[PDB]
Amino acid sequence: SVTGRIVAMASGAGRPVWGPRDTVSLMRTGFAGNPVGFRSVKLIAEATAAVPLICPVLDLLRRPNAGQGRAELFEALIGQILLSGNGYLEAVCPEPGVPRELHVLRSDRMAVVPGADGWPVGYDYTVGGRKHRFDMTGHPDPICHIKSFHPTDDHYGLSPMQAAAVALDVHNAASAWSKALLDNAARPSGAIIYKGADGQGVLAPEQYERLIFEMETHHQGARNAGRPMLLEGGLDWKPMGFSPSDMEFHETKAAAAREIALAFGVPPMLIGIPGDATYANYAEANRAFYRLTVLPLLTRVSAALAWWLSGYLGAQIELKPDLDQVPALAVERDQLWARIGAAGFLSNSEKRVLLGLPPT
Amino acid sequence: SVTGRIVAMASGAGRPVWGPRDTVSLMRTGFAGNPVGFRSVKLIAEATAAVPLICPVLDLLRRPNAGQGRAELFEALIGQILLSGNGYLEAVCPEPGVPRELHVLRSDRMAVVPGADGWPVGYDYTVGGRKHRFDMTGHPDPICHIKSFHPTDDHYGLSPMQAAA
Amino acid sequence: GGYLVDPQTSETIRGVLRSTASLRQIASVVNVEATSFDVLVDKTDMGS
Amino acid sequence: TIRGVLRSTASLRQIASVVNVEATSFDVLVDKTDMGSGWASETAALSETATPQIDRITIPLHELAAMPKASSAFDIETWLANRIADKFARAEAAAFISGDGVDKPTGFLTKTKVANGAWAWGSLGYVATGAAGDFAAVNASDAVVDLVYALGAEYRANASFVMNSKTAGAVRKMKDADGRFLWADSLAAGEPARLMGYPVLIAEDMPDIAANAYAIAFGDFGNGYTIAERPDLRVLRDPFSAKPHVLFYASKRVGGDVSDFAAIKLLKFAA
Amino acid sequence: MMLNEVTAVPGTALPVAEFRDHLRLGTGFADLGAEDAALLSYLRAAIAAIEGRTAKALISRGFRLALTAWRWGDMQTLPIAPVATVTALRLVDAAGVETPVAAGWRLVPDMARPRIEALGAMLPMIPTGGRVEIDFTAGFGASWSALPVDLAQAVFLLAAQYYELRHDGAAAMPFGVMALIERWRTVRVLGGRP
């Protein structure tokens, strides 16, 4: 905070700081463009919305606004964090405490203002040429700004799609390689070469319609596969091939489809990409998914809702994921109940306090 | 909310916003065209209809209308969400509470209207050149608009077929 | 004092009203995405 | 980190009345004269003493635009945004002081000055120094002090001097008959920043000492000069027009002239 | 990109009196001028053959390079190689108005890459639907003596050939016509986008 004043002047106080320009184009080319970048965010954002929470405040979260439910809110919230590294939540307060409206402001059209002491004073929702200038020079601070970790930038997040932005363009263009190869390719199944007495000679349109009708009827198609095809003088049939037949950038697409899944943190088994068996039997890969890239993400966002929404209340509230009755963690729950349940030496109430039960 | 009021006047209030151009052509080439895209939607839409629900109101859901059962409704509903990212349900209310008709409106011929404050005021069912202009300036709001998540658009869904196009 | 007071304007920029009947109402429109459209009619009937 | 030349920052923005305006113009409404009430007679008609004729002065709220073409060691988006905000903070400073009427705010120097003592409303008052080249030779600073005391006691509650650097130089060059520096006596003092009990604003767009130039101003610019503006800065991060050069578009709109012609007094270096 | 010539060569600058010494016509005859109408017809036909195989100019006549869209964002390599003192990048408009522009463009002289690189990171923009003709005088020198002599010899090896055989009749030197030309051709290996 003491050094906060020094970085603020360099950027320029009172003026909007934009950060990354090409953020909106990674969405259309990397999330609406390829299925791997599409499925990876949809797999996470529909997983963090499904996790229950532990606190009143959750009555706001259950019904944030019209037409945007509890689970639909976090899909919009985490879906901006995975896409552009930043999450925004406007609170509309007709009432003084616990404001009854939440709105995920998209992070394409939002810009920060550094202000005096380096910590932000303005946020600017910029649609068309129109700005809004939300104000942070107050106590309730009407927008929570959830940052992904960015080491070099002081105001935004890193957005894992930016780290995979080369592997998206490999997977977008290798998939479009095979598309435009199926659309721009002339393979013939042969060529009836007609030289003539000279090195060059055309055949007359009388002879040419004769050549079609014996080729149309008697030689093409499945039903004429293999006629013995008499070739008189001058004529010759050179059959062409198609030498790379399968596998046009097949492994570099399948390797880039795994590096996209690597950056968002989904395992290759969940998304459905082919590859070597790393995880075994989905009791691991679903448990690894909710432990390395979902529950760390959800306990970081819920820790920002636990502090931003407590600024509207008087008493501070904690708000964490449940990490109980989330059915992907049952292999960590069998393993912990059967450990203490088999420990017969310590008594009955001495293990209800370990497994989390109210003792009797 | 406050941001939404500014967003409206950029696109244009009172005028229909269409969104995806090709969503009528991805259906014929991606759902009636290949078996893999056909079976994938049929595998999901016949799975969501089979799941029971927990609540009266479900008596409407069991028998929404003539010739369109409970399981046939969600196959039509999810079959529009997987195809075009948007689900629509018209309710006909002769009675004030629990309207006895549900209809899956197809999302090819439906268009949104942003209205004044950014949240929608009109939905336009456009077949041929003929419109309807459903009204959202009331409390019961006769169409539920189920969106798939779309980060760039403010009015529609993303439709996984568009991602696999 | 004439600079002190300023007029009140209308709430909306209003326009001259022109007709809406357009033959779009009575002809048949098609939701199409193309560069051309090709109707298929039968000029004459088969001989019987 | 890319460096630049460090230009002057003091801009008359912090001592003039900054009004956030949203329309096309800002209309200030000042009466030109007094009520004119007289002591009534005990047997007289006594009617229609007078009425102050009001006047609307229009702040046109012009716009300012600079359009550079962009054409990974240092990052242009932040640096050019930190240069063009400085240029918009400095180019409006020239318009606030010596701007003319066309498309830009008219500065307080361009308002048809009349010698004080014959002061009317439509102008600004000045006081003469003496000889035309510089301050008076016999008694320097007499022009400064009667510039202070020829203004009005109500505006001198919070008034300030406006000079550039090399007029404050010529002020600090004033010395007594022993040469002891009337302002900031020693060579160890520095800028005392409280000339005649009033602050000094070093605004470089003021003219320097010349044959007739008005190099020193003094006033309560909070009543005198009204800067009406819109606080934002447009940022068109343009990805079109030229593939080779980004050609960012940045614009701020701002206007202003004098609201009160009694607040500002000038020092004419002539007879 | 049209690249026409404003003015041709004068003809009097061509060394017809020295080409006649090359071809061994005759020394002291009283006629001496029956071939003058045709000898410069083959010198202009051999220079223009070597001006196309080498993309050089050789007499420094004035050119006019009328083009519409810039080939690269800022560079604009000129076709005719040995240049000096680009006169005018007058920027015509969609129709009519021709405004010459100093425009902050430079000229990078080279025999291989005669660029016109701009200094403001973007050449002067082009009114949509209008061309940008560039007047420039490109060549080695004004007279025949200012040429590289091996290229001047390649004209004399070639225009002597057109004088000695009229139609395409077939007929190995160490430094022939071709081996003198090849250090003046343009060696390029780009078929790419930029």
* Interface probe with B: pick from A28, A80, A81, A106, most Cβ of B within 10 Å: A106
| Type of residue found at D180 | R
User: Under DSSP, is residue D217 helix (H, G, I), strand (E, B) or coil?
Assistant: strand
3-state DSSP assignment of residue A187: coil
* Residue D25 in tokens: 């113009």
Partner C contacted by B153 (CB < 8 A): no
Return the sign of the alpha-carbon dihedral for residues A293, A296, A300, A301.
positive
With contact defined as beta carbons under 8 Å apart, do A38 and A32 qualify? yes
Strands E91-92 and D264-268: unpaired
The three-state DSSP-derived secondary structure of A33-85 is CCHHHHHHHHHHHHHHCCCCEECCHHHHHHCCECCECHHHHHHHHHHHHHHHC
User: Please, which experimental method was used?
Assistant: cryo-EM
Nearby residues of D5 by Cβ (< 8 Å), 6 or more positions away: none
- Phi and psi angles of residue A336, each rounded to the nearest 5 degrees, phi first: -100, -25
Would you state the structure tokens that stand for residue D78, as one six-digit string?
Answer: 């932040």
Helix, strand, coil % in chain E, rounded to nearest 5:
25, 15, 60
Listed residue (B141, B112, B142) closest to B125, CA to CA: B112
Which residues in chain B (109-138) have CB-CB distances under 8 A to chain A? Answer: 119
- Angle between the N-to-C axes of helices A165-183 and A35-48, in degrees from 0 to 180, rounded to the nearest 10: 130
Q: A213, A214, A245, A210: which is closest to A227 by C-alpha? A: A214
Cβ B12 vs Cβ B42: under 8 Å: no
Three-point CA angle A117, A118, A122, nearest 5°: 100
- CA dist D88 and D248 (Å) reads 14
- Pick the closest to residue B151 from A169, A23, A322, E178 (CA basis): A23
Task: Please answer yes or no on whether D55 and C1 come within 8 Å at the CB atom.
Answer: no
* Dihedral of alpha carbons D73, D78, D84, D85, sign: negative
HSE at residue C9, side-chain half, CA atoms within 13 A, is 4
In 3D space, the residue among A175, A157, A162 whose CA is nearest the CA of residue A30 turns out to be A162
Distance, in Å, from the CA atom of B47 to the CA atom of B65, rounded to the nearest integer, reads 21
Neighbours of A356 (CB within 10 A): 8
Q: How far apart are CA B138 and CA B142, in angstroms?
A: 9
Euclidean distance between CA atoms C19 and C36, whole angstroms: 29
Exposure b/e, D215-247, CB count within 10 A at least 16 = b: bbbbbbbbbbbbbbbbebbbbeeeeeebebbbb
Phi-psi category of residue D130: left, alpha or beta, with phi > 0 → left and psi -120 to 50 → alpha = left
Closest CA to E128 of E179, E154, E181, E92: E92
Burial tier of D267 (Cβ tally within 10 Å: 0-12, 13-18, 19+): buried
3-state DSSP assignment of residue B78: helix
| Phi, psi of A101, rounded to the nearest 5 degrees | -135, 130
Q: How far is CA C43 from CA C40, C47, C48, D125, D186, in A?
A: 10, 13, 16, 94, 111
State both tokens at D48.
Answer: 């229609």
Which residues on A lie below 8 Å from B154 (Cβ)?
Answer: 106
Closest approach of chain D CAs to the CA of A126, in angstroms? Answer: 10
Q: Identify which of D233, D237, D239 has the shortest CB distance to residue A15.
A: D233
**B contacts of A124 (beta carbons < 8 Å):** none
Q: According to DSSP H, which parts of A144-249 are helical?
A: 160-163, 165-183, 205-216
Residue D18: phi and psi, rounded to 5, are -95, 115
Which residues 1-48 on chain C approach chain D with CB closer than 8 angstroms? 1, 3-4
A127's tokens: 């649609």
Please give the resolution of this entry in Å, rounded to 1 decimal: 4.5
Give residue B84's Cα distance to chain centre. Answer: 8
User: Are the beta carbons of A93 and A312 closer than 8 angstroms?
Assistant: yes
- Token pair for B124: 């336009």
Q: Which of B4, B10, B162 sits opposite A128 (nearest CB)?
A: B10
Nearest-Cα residue of chain D relative to residue C1:
D54
Which CA distances in Å does D179 have to A96, A291, D137? 67, 81, 14
Q: Is A72 on the interface with B (CB under 8 A)?
A: yes
Q: What's A159's DSSP letter?
A: -
Q: Which residue has the tokens 């929608």?
A: B120
Strand partners, D249: D236
Query: Residue D52: which of D70, D37, D69 has the closest Cα?
Result: D37
E strands present in B71-163: 86-92, 101-104, 110-113, 122-125, 134-135, 143-147
Contact assessment for residue A29 and residue A164, using Cβ atoms and an 8 Å cutoff: no
> How do E4-5 and D249-258 pair as beta strands?
unpaired
Between the alpha carbon of residue A137 and those of residues A119, B54, D98, the distances in Å are: 10, 46, 35
Instruction: Indicate if the alpha-carbon torsion angle D162, D164, D169, D174 is positive or negative.
Output: negative
Interruption sites in chain A after residues (C→N beyond 2.5 Å): 55
Contact partners, residue B23, CB within 8 Å, separation at least 6: B83, B84, B107, B108, B159, B162
E72 contacts on D by Cβ (under 8 Å): 244
A69: left (phi over 0), alpha (psi -120 to 50) or beta: beta
- Angstrom distance (rounded) from CA D9 to CA D202: 9
DSSP E87: E
- Helix segments in chain B, DSSP class H: 2-11, 25-30, 35-48, 57-62, 70-84, 160-163
Q: What tokens does E61 get?
A: 């006549």
Instruction: Kindly tell me the burial class for residue B34, based on how many C-beta atoms sit within 10 Å of its own C-beta (0-12, 13-18, 19 or more).
Output: exposed
Which residues of chain D neighbour C4 with C-beta distances below 8 Å? 29, 54
**Which of A296, A320, A306 lies closest to A148 in space, CA to CA?**
A296
| Residue D68 to residue D79: CA distance in whole angstroms | 12
Smallest CA–CA separation between A114 and chain B, in Å?
20
The three-state secondary structure class of E162 is: helix
Write down the residue that tokens 């992904």 correspond to. A148
Which residues in chain C touch residue B21, judged by CB atoms under 8 angstroms apart?
33
DSSP E118: B
Residues 6 or more apart whose CB falls under 8 angstroms from that of B122 comprise B14, B16, B112, B113, B115, B133, B134, B135, B136
Contacts of E121 in chain D (CB under 8 A): 69-71, 244-245
Sort strands B101-104 and B86-92 into parallel, antiparallel or unpaired. antiparallel
